[PDB]
């Protein structure tokens, strides 16, 4: 679903994810990639290490900058096809939605429905 998963075998991702969680347990490792059909800027770096207290809204501010989004432009995150609340912390998202490789996966779109 994620290009990160096609280029990196599961065992490699999982070993990396376990190590990153051990070294920085107060932080969340995140893979961010554009959702299919999204009409929006490409992201230059996909792998992030974020404070667990960072909110989804603060992460939006950071991602919007990197993709050069205008003030009128919408940005939406999806984790397992669900839009997380902008007030949620990245740690809350990680607990409920991390994958078996110990990464949290976020798709982003200009559309409020994933893959629309």
């Amino acid at each position: 679903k994620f290009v990160y998963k096609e280029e990196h075998p599961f065992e490699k991702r999982r070993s990396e994810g376990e190590k990153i969680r051990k070294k920085y347990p107060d932080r969340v490792p995140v893979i961010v990639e554009k959702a299919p059909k999204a009409r929006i800027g490409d992201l230059d770096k996909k792998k992030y290490l974020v404070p667990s207290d960072l909110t989804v809204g603060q992460f939006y501010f950071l991602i919007r900058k990197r993709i050069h989004l205008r003030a009128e432009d919408a940005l939406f995150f999806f984790v397992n096809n669900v839009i997380p609340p902008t007030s949620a912390t990245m740690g809350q998202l990680y607990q409920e939605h991390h994958e078996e490789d110990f990464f949290l996966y976020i798709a982003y779109s200009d559309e409020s429905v994933y893959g629309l």
Partner: peptide
């Protein structure tokens, strides 16, 4: 360009971007 205030490149992995704890103050 070098990122320092809100983000920084991971020293070991140029491919992991580290968001600083100061980014938790953003509004």
């Amino acid at each position: 360009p070098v990122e320092e205030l809100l983000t920084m490149e991971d020293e070991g992995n140029s491919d992991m971007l580290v968001v600083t704890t100061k980014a938790g103050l953003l509004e």
